[PDB]
Amino acid sequence: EHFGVQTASVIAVLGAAGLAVGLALQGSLSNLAAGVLLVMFRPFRAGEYVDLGGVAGTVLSVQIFSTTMRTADGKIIVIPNGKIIAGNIINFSREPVRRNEFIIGVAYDSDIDQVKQILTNIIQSEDRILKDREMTVRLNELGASSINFVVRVWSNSGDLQNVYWDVLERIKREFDAAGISFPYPQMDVNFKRV
Amino acid sequence: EHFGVQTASVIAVLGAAGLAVGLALQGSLSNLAAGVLLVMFRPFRAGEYVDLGGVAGTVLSVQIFSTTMRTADGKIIVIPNGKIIAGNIINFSREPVRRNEFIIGVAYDSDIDQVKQILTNIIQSEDRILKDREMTVRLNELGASSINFVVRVWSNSGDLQNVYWDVLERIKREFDAAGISFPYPQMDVNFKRV
Ligand SMILES: CCCCCCCCCCCC
Ligand SMILES: CCCCCCCCCCCC
């Protein structure tokens, strides 16, 4: 507003260039805004295992335009912040306690009471399974070749996979020793010709 | 702004032509901006194996409007930069260390302790498997006809496939010699007529 030979000769071009860039760079501003929101509102922090639209992995850092997370295998993934904000964010390592689910399929002949008692004994003897939570051991479904039970136990988000593996191995050992048998796919074949 | 018979007689047409081209060429400017961003921010460099929206292959070079990557087979692929930026970029060769996963399915009768000891011995004897990382060998699932273990070992991104092949061959050899048996699909057939 002071001189027309100092900025008008350059503003007439700078404004048009900026408008053209914004029109072409609209995605850039969208990503920048999404990143600013992600820094302000923290759905996930660095080092938190998250799943962003079917791409799960540990989050490394939220940058200006994209956030890079290292998956379990070890491959780096870069996701624009716009789609991260526009989609659902599943945070695996937010709640301190998570739940394990087992599906043990025993044969039909297997006694229900014995199986439930064995599963309850296995669940209780584990000190990493929170007792104040719900420990469910009940028959769930009558499968094609085996009735499968469901075991649900809550454990700290840290020692969850270890609890799962230990419980599964102990279940197999006890069932093998106790007498319960895991059945192979059973087929009933009938004959009509010698 | 100096003469109306020098540029006005041509600007009135040049501006309209440029506007029409930009309207028709909007994708061209979008691709150019995406390419500029890819050169500035480097999610992937030339010679880095990447996966861009379900199209994996070594990246050759980022051009003005598209980047050509040569897949594993040897076929060249050209992808506009706009969709490259708008999508997720998985970088396989960014982290120096990556993880291998094995799924060995042994028969139910196979002893768990012997199988785990054999797998651990195989894992440790390999000098290309990083010891400071996590070497997981534990029973993972009770399959329909075979309990399958999971082996996870970290190795340098360079000698990863070679490690996988060597470990798999050694596993087969030891299991064949040790006594462990890989089971064929087992079916339990019952009879109700002679
Ligand atoms: C464009 C509107 C922005 C509104 C910002 C709300 C403030 C959020 C702060 C939350 C702190 C945990
Ligand atoms: C349209 C906004 C462009 C912002 C450019 C940010 C600078 C990035 C430089 C990164 C160097 C590694």
Residue numbers in the entry:
A (entry chain A), B (entry chain G): 136 to 329
Which sentences from the paper describe this structure?
To further investigate this hypothesis, we explored a chimeric construct comprising the sensing module of YnaI and the conductivity module of MscS. The chimera purified under condition III and analysed by cryo-EM shows an open state with a novel pore architecture, in which we did not observe pore lipids. Upon opening, the angle between helices TM3a and TM3b decreases from 135° to 100°, which is more than in WT-MscS (135° to 120°). This leads to a funnel-like shape of the chimera pore and results in a unique positioning of the sensor paddles compared to the conductivity module, while they remain a rigid body. The outward movement of helix TM3a shifts them further clockwise (viewed from the periplasmic side) than in WT-MscS, but the paddles do not tilt within the plane of the membrane. Upon opening, the diameter of the TM part changes from 69 Å to 80 Å on the periplasmic side, while it remains unchanged at the cytosolic side. For the YnaI-MscS chimera, which inherited the pore helices TM3a and 3b and the cytosolic vestibule from MscS and therefore misses the di-glycine hinge of the YnaI pore, we did not observe the diminishing of the kink dividing the helices TM3a and TM3b and the outwards bending of the helix TM3a. Instead, pore shortening in the chimera is realised by reducing the kink angle, which gives rise to the observed funnel-shaped pore and is also accompanied by area expansion on the periplasmic side. The YnaI-MscS chimera follows this observation, as its periplasmic in-plane area expansion is ~13 nm2, correlating with a similarly high pressure required for opening.
